[PDB]
Design a binder for this molecule. Structure first.
Ligand SMILES: Nc1ncnc2c1ncn2[C@@H]1O[C@H](COP(=O)(O)OP(=O)(O)CP(=O)(O)O)[C@@H](O)[C@H]1O
Ligand SMILES: Nc1ncnc2c1ncn2[C@@H]1O[C@H](COP(=O)(O)OP(=O)(O)CP(=O)(O)O)[C@@H](O)[C@H]1O
Ligand code: NA
Ligand code: NA
Ligand code: NA
Ligand code: NA
Lengths: 314, 312
């Protein structure tokens, strides 16, 4: 049994390294190309699996080489692929990424097969969703499919962790009311609320607007400032800082955070939210110390033992 | 036995279709992704093979899934892959292409394995090159390998067709003196000559500079305006127009043209140059009426009978 079930996206990353970013109408040469594995849903599932979660990815990829290779990436990370569907009717989702020597980029995302994950696929996954401890979803599949997954999870008493990423300004109200944990970043929170979110203070105001739409718990992640949390039972904002580290590459840090939080929700339910967030921050900040999105996510064996204690730790 | 040997590039085209092109630091979403098969060398080879040429593609790809798929693309088009190599040391060459709804694009090319096609790889193809009628090269592999290929062909009395694409201003002079037929587009002629090329007349002036640098025949393609040709024996420029068509997608039209020219030089050696160029304009103009690159290249069975008749 998979205790963390991620209903969401997989994307093949097609990355070209250049010295300068091209403009409209330009052809340029780069010096290296390589392929990597991304998608917010797969990223989150990877982090939770590497911490020791029994995970399953509910997703759709193409009946194509990229899709086959994605399946193998999931397997290599000890993720169940029992609900990794394929389709003849769309290509695997892609992210075509051009990167310069300073790490600035142009990204073109084509959702592809991710949008064909459908009701009938969710119905086939009903038992796996219902038997989980946590169901995680984002907004890189059809929003209605995410909503159906939240609905199914809630009907089974399964904890719902919703990551509205990338954000949409006007979400169906049920996105809020069906979310036990609503987790977003500063820029997302700006889009959802129409407010500036630069600081922890600003995040507390944004988070309260989100809480009042019917979330049980709101978390806004804040980069190097950690995160801010509020809940229905404790609506005063709590700012949970992260220790200073030397960041190499922050890409994917949010997905690291969310995957770690899903792990702790499923495996350490006894812990307070604050303790779960302290630990999640730590893991995410480990990921920012290395290049390469999924390749940067740490494994349990590489992490401090104190992150896995059953009790509250000073 | 191969009558047309192409020594040149294979590139996997990774294409995203969008409504707008992205700026620095922007993530945008497009509506379709697909993989296509490109590279000037392979494109020219595919066109000549579709016309009925027996062809051999001398090239290098990765020992990777793209490379295996490229090899299958060449086989599907009936092209010999005897001297299509694979290497562990680089990935198959790539073009990551973003195209908006008005057809404007951003292209990032990583040549990759194409650059690792070396003189030893080419030497192994000596018997096939010596038995060919036409050798075709471009500027998408390492210069030393293409110069050696043109050298081999000359030693065997094999007609050389050189496409200086993409063009470089400081072109090695041997590319002129080793080319029996030198074919480039307007923007390429500008780069090579420093002259502005915005009409058929301008093209004739640029072509004459190329001729005096040591080419035997110079052809400048001109898009919808067809092409201009001059030669040592007939140095007066001849403008050869193409009938008006409704273009769907002109990508790869130059490679269709060059591939068709290679076919005619190999299989219809008795036709005049002017007749070959009329026929090659017609075939390229077919290619512009279909979307894509290689998928737009027409097959013999789909073309007018007159294009395959032994005489004018
Ligand atoms: N510079 C930094 N130092 C320490 N921790 C960091 C950090 N940047 C991010 N984190 C950690 O990662 C978590 C997620 O951050 P956030 O959601 O802002 O990342 P992100 O995925 O949007 C970065 P990117 O835009 O580059 O992908 C934070 O709550 C924090 O725990
Ligand atoms: N709009 C059009 N109508 C008819 N024939 C066309 C055409 N565009 C190109 N061609 C044919 O293709 C040949 C090669 O054209 P050229 O070398 O200019 O192509 P290209 O691959 O550089 C695309 P473009 O011409 O749009 O820049 C021309 O000589 C002509 O025969
Ligand atoms: Na995120
Ligand atoms: Na990282
Ligand atoms: Na060309
Ligand atoms: Na075309």
């Amino acid at each position: 049994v998979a205790a963390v079930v991620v209903v969401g996206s997989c994307m093949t990353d097609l990355v070209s390294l250049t010295s300068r970013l091209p403009k409209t109408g330009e052809t340029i040469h780069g010096h290296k190309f390589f392929i990597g594995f991304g998608g917010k849903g797969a990223n989150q599932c990877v982090q939770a699996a590497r911490l020791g979660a029994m995970t399953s990815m509910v997703c759709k990829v193409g009946k194509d080489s990229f899709g086959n290779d994605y399946i193998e990436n999931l397997k290599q990370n000890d993720i169940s692929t029992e609900f990794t569907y394929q389709t003849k009717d769309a290509a695997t989702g892609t992210a075509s990424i051009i990167v310069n020597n300073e790490g600035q980029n142009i990204i073109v995302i084509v959702a592809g097969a991710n949008l064909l994950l459908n009701t009938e696929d969710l119905r086939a996954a009903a038992n796996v969703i219902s038997r989980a401890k946590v169901m995680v979803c984002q907004l890189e599949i059809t929003p209605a499919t995410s909503l159906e997954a939240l609905t199914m999870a809630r009907r089974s008493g399964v904890k719902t962790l919703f990551n509205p990423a990338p954000a949409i300004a006007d979400l169906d109200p049920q996105f809020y009311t069906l979310s036990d944990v609503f987790c977003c970043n500063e820029s997302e929170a700006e889009i959802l609320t129409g407010l500036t979110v630069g600081s922890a203070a600003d995040a507390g105001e944004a988070a309260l607007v989100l809480l009042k739409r019917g979330c049980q718990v709101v978390i806004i992640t804040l980069g190097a400032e950690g995160c801010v949390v509020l809940s229905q039972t404790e609506p005063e904002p709590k700012h949970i800082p992260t220790e200073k580290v030397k960041a190499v590459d922050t890409t994917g840090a949010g997905d690291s955070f969310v995957g770690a939080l899903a792990f702790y929700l499923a495996y350490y339910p006894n812990l307070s939210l604050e303790d779960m967030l302290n630990r999640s921050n730590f893991i995410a900040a480990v990921s920012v110390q290395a290049a390469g999105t999924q390749s940067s996510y740490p494994y349990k064996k590489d992490l401090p033992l104190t992150l896995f204690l059953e009790h509250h730790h000073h």
